[PDB]
Scaffold this active site. Sequence first.
Site, PDB file in Angstrom:
ATOM      1  N   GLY C 113       0.793  -1.206   0.000  1.00 30.18           N
ATOM      2  CA  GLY C 113       0.000   0.000   0.000  1.00 30.18           C
ATOM      3  C   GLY C 113       0.832   1.265   0.000  1.00 30.18           C
ATOM      4  O   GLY C 113       2.031   1.241  -0.281  1.00 30.18           O
ATOM      5  N   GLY C 116       4.303   4.030   4.664  1.00 31.19           N
ATOM      6  CA  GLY C 116       4.508   4.928   5.777  1.00 31.19           C
ATOM      7  C   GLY C 116       3.335   5.847   5.998  1.00 31.19           C
ATOM      8  O   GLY C 116       3.507   7.043   6.230  1.00 31.19           O
ATOM      9  N   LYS C 119       2.038   2.513   8.560  1.00 30.49           N
ATOM     10  CA  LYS C 119       2.266   1.077   8.430  1.00 30.49           C
ATOM     11  C   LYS C 119       3.366   0.623   9.372  1.00 30.49           C
ATOM     12  O   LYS C 119       3.239  -0.388  10.077  1.00 30.49           O
ATOM     13  CB  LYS C 119       2.648   0.774   6.988  1.00 30.49           C
ATOM     14  CG  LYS C 119       1.604   1.216   5.996  1.00 30.49           C
ATOM     15  CD  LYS C 119       2.131   1.178   4.574  1.00 30.49           C
ATOM     16  CE  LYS C 119       2.255  -0.226   4.009  1.00 30.49           C
ATOM     17  NZ  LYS C 119       2.612  -0.213   2.556  1.00 30.49           N
ATOM     18  N   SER C 436      -4.525  -0.856 -17.585  1.00 28.80           N
ATOM     19  CA  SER C 436      -5.177  -0.288 -16.425  1.00 28.80           C
ATOM     20  C   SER C 436      -6.011   0.910 -16.837  1.00 28.80           C
ATOM     21  O   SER C 436      -7.034   1.200 -16.213  1.00 28.80           O
ATOM     22  CB  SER C 436      -4.154   0.097 -15.360  1.00 28.80           C
ATOM     23  OG  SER C 436      -3.278   1.099 -15.834  1.00 28.80           O
ATOM     24  N   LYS C 479      -7.571   4.580  -7.126  1.00 30.39           N
ATOM     25  CA  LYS C 479      -7.509   5.672  -8.087  1.00 30.39           C
ATOM     26  C   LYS C 479      -8.718   6.595  -7.954  1.00 30.39           C
ATOM     27  O   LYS C 479      -8.590   7.811  -8.120  1.00 30.39           O
ATOM     28  CB  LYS C 479      -7.409   5.109  -9.501  1.00 30.39           C
ATOM     29  CG  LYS C 479      -6.146   4.323  -9.769  1.00 30.39           C
ATOM     30  CD  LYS C 479      -6.062   3.930 -11.229  1.00 30.39           C
ATOM     31  CE  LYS C 479      -7.034   2.839 -11.586  1.00 30.39           C
ATOM     32  NZ  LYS C 479      -6.646   1.566 -10.934  1.00 30.39           N
TER      33      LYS C 479
END
Lengths: 532, 532, 532
Positions: C113, C116, C119, C436, C479
């Site tokens: 992900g 920081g 996390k 994507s 997104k």
Amino acid sequence: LSDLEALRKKIEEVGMPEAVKTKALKELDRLERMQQGSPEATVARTYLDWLTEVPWSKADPEVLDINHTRQVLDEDHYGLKDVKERILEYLAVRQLTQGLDVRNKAPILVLVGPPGVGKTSLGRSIARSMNRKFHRISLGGVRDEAEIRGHRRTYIGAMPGKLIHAMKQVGVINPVILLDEIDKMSSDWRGDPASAMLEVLDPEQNNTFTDHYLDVPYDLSKVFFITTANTLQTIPRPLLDRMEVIEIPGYTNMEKQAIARQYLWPKQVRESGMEGRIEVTDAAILRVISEYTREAGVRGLERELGKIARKGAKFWLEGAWEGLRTIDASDIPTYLGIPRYRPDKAETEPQVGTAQGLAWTPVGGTLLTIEVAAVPGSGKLSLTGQLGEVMKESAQAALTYLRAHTQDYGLPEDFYNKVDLHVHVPDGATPKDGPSAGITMATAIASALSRRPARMDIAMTGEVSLRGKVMPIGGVKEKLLAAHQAGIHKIVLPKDNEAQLEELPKEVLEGLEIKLVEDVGEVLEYLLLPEP
Amino acid sequence: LSDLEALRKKIEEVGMPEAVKTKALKELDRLERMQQGSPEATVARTYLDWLTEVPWSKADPEVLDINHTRQVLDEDHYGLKDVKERILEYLAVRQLTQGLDVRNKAPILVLVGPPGVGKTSLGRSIARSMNRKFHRISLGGVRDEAEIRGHRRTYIGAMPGKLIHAMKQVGVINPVILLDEIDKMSSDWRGDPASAMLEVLDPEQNNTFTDHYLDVPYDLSKVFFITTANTLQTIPRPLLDRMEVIEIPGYTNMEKQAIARQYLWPKQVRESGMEGRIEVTDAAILRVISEYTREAGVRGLERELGKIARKGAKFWLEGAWEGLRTIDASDIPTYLGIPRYRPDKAETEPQVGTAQGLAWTPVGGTLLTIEVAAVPGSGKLSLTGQLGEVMKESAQAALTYLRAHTQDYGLPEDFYNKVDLHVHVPDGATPKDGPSAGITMATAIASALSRRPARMDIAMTGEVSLRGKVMPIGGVKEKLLAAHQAGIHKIVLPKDNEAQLEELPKEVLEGLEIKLVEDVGEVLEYLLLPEP
Amino acid sequence: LSDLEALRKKIEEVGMPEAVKTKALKELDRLERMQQGSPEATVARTYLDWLTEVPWSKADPEVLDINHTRQVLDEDHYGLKDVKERILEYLAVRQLTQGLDVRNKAPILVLVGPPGVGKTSLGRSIARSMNRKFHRISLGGVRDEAEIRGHRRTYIGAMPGKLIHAMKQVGVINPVILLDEIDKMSSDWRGDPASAMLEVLDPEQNNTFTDHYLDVPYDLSKVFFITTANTLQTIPRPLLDRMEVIEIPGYTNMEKQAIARQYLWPKQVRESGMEGRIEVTDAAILRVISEYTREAGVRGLERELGKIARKGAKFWLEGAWEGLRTIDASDIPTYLGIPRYRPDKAETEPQVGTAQGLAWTPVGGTLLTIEVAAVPGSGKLSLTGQLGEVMKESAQAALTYLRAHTQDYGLPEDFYNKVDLHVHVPDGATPKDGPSAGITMATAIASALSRRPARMDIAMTGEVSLRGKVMPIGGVKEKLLAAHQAGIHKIVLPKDNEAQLEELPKEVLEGLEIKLVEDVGEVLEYLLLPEP
């Protein structure tokens, strides 16, 4: 055995300050036994031998006329007297900054040049010109402050530093000490010498520069320190502080013969013991330069000098006939033996795969030749002779210049695609792969493209453009020095470093014709009478 | 010896951990049997020397007045008003966690930037302000904790690190520590002290700190530290971690002139010992900067100042005809030589294949001389200058926008279907990483396709589109630093970053021709000598 | 010797296993020679110092709770309260850990992900909620296995791996170890350590994980690993095992602002030393969110806060009219820089030939204006950005559609015949592999071809089926969180991602109006400001 009475009177009668009087009383405490040997008594007695002979507040006054010093500058070398001006600069600083720590941490003119030129001449020139004491202690090749400072009293083999070897060998606390091989130390075992060099180089803590032999620190107040190396990029950057780069121009041939006949050859006559009996012509000396010594120094030249000196001196022992034994070019191999070099090196019988370029190393020049194999094939570039990548891009830029300039110089237009190009430059293995000879690359390229003789005695060095220029390049000094030593007299230089052309002493340019270039097409006439 | 008894006094009357007491009494247990004995004598007596000499339990007053510190921060290299900002921030940050909190955990704000900024003078001004003992160690190239620590307590031949000698240098447990060259440390052999940089970064990780020579936790939490460096890209990211970087912009030339006329040459007179005897004009220093060193910063200019101060020392020492020597601009040619350059270059002969880009590493900035061989081959690209594919993306996209107008800039239809294209950057890769000067590339393309001369003195750099639209570079202040240290006052700047343009001192923006552009045919009209 | 005692009894005072203490005494008996003066004995001294300073089964308290573990999980950023269920399910693994003592053949949790966002602090709450020691370790650019295993002792100066030295740093056999940037492994320098960490992560082989500096295989049985990354589709297959991705979505501006005011702004308020001496209005906080950082991260927002706190700490030090001050939205360009970002990024004067659309990064999701140059030529396709062929064939699908839709939306009959097509995506191989965002490309294509002006504030992304359709993907959620935090409001998604709207908040989707269609002519209509 009256060692104790003698060492007492040594302490009493050699000058010593108070802490030094106390350290001598400590040595007296390690004295007072009834034998020799016994390495307490030995190290203490030798310690007093060092101590009483290293002076203490003992000096000599200095005549400080910079002009008489400049009159002493007129000695010791014919010279070009160029950075003798820079010596005058630092000594003008000295003659101003007199007894003031208004000036603190003064840089002291470190010497770098070709080896075998007179450096010690300059040092004694200073020392005499200041009524100071010359001495040398050779302090390179060192990896150890047990060399530089002391070796231990608690050890068997208690040595002082090589400094204290010099200071025992001086009687004044104001000498001038010449410092050797200063770009040539190391450190792999037991310390960095460069830090002790920085402490002596520190002009406060040199007065408290202490050894691992010693007990009370020694004054290095009025000692001048002068330092000598011969290459340039291997300087310790902490030691870069408080130094000043003094580049020596190597001497040229007539300069060398001037230094020889003005200074060296009368010494050689005296070393033969002659009153002057051999009569050395000077084109003979030119021949001596030509085929027996390669240097910018005096060493092998003076070796051949002493060679003829000893040989004719023996001949004079073998009968005396003349004080007019006139030495010519011809008798030289009877004196010097088989000729070590050719008479000619510009002679190449000019042919195709040929380059002739200028470069130099910090102890000697070199020339630059290129093989270009142009084989029918598919068109490619090959880099051999340990070639760099600035080499690659420079040669490629020249290559594509000619791709833009094919029929402009009589070349077929698709030559990038049917002929593979091997580039052997074995002095690409000389470590400067900087943009020094791109024009020379281009010429060897155009030579092998022409398949026509790249011509002799035309030396070139510098940069380019892809459209074709002659960009400004540096180090033209030592290159013109070596090209005179190469004896080339058609020298291709930038018409963009021509602002730097008249920055030089004019004797070299009188000796050396310059074919100044700013066009690339100008040099394309030079090495090809067959441009087709 | 009673000397060693005094060593015991000078250790065991200095406040110590009893770990020091224990280890030193065991040294005394090795200096109870090895007196003149084995180097167990020698390493232990040097060990107790280190224990005498490294300070414990000391003090030094700190900074207290932020704005008297600002006063000192104007007494510095110059006022400059951009980083002393951060300095006072760092100050007040520390002063609020004075009271010694865990809030003291922070980066120490490395001073990363190009030479000639008086890097030392920053911390020298700090030690003026903090009234706290300044020190430096050069930190370049360190690859060992054998370079940071010992590896032996026994067998003399191994020593502490530079840091501990710096401690033995001072007599306090709180100095100012200037940390040099933190980019220039080099992870080379296994054993690199990269985590020891975190140790001297992390304040409780060096409150308990030691070598493998001296063996006790020694305080460095009480010790202030601050780093400085030059260029960001080489710094290791965990060392970039727990670290915030302070970028250093350059100077402007009249700011440097102020730096001279208020500070430098007065200090050149300080070291020359000529106080009240020399006069130097201002436009002299203008001509000095504009013609002699193109270096970013002050250093070569400072050295030329010292050079001419020494010249004046010489000529004054040709006799005192004045209490005050006085010197204009016209004799600095006698005092420096033939001019190395000329003032701001608007005279470099506009160029039919060539363009000039801006660049700035934080060791300095420049133009980039960029050329495309338009050699009629098959029609294809070449990235000469040994390039990365960021150049390929940049030039091909700009090139593709050039393909968008294959008549609308006076050119024929195909050049990429017909002519092989060879694009040269003077460096291998992008200075400001990735495409930041693509318009210069296209500019040289338009030149070399036109064979029309390209306008000198009007530089260009920036980012492109396929549709020919300016994308914004950042750090454009340093592009203008590159322009002004090149003396360019005609700068093609983004209409994008015109709000960013507002963020500057107007001393940066003195008389600059800003061509606010947001498209490309704008600069095609701006940058070739005709519009074609 | 003293080092002999010190390094010797470490065999007999540190509890070693039998083969360990066996080879330790073998080191002892191979040695006990003259150690100092030989480098092979110094590296053997280190070779002791790894074994004699590595832990042996010492551990942390084993407490496996879910409830107060969850209470320490309540300390998270914003109270996200979804993946703490994944944490307690991993504690349910720790509750179901019977057949092993640490249950692998079970997901041991890679974390992929925005790095920081807490996390690491999630791991901090873990080490708090499991009463452990904690360390990170990071793996960017790592491709070596001697940074993993012990380097080959057959090379002198060999070392244990970074993990193994990290376990020579941390002394329990159950620490929380954060496994960072593990997505950067390859086989360039001695194999791929993906298989090395496979072998570390083997449940029955970690107990004897072999190293080859320390040749006894090292034990792992209970070390609390926690794996973390930024990619999920470039993970190699063995490190794609026995784990599962747990990802945290994007904290919205009120959510980030609650992380600020709940946690991070009182953190700076403390860590300014101004505890209750700064209030800031929260609209200023939102304004900072909108204008000074554009981040999926959160730390740079608190770095903004750091700059704020340093400014205010100065200003209170430069005048204390209040302890507690009010900071409105007015001093935000004063107490920070100029607002870097417009809060409204929807002013981009909507394009004609180039399309903005969503994009996936290892730090999450974003927006990119993919450019197209429909250049005249031979009829070609040129995807730049160093793209995947997935992009190229989805572009081919767009070409296919427009070959089927030539006079449907108004197009030339050449984009494949005499019109080359230049394509530039700003990035390369997306972590969201495959198309994507291929529909945005197709819109940029018809933007350049049909020449109709597009629209900003319409984000779109997905696949282009060669049916002439759009097929849905995952990963468009984050997104959409980006475009939500980018203040975008019109989204075209395929129809089957209507059910993918369900796990996304509608408060994200109130501004984001959605156009759930997967026809290609319909997405030709919904972007462009004229729909054909």
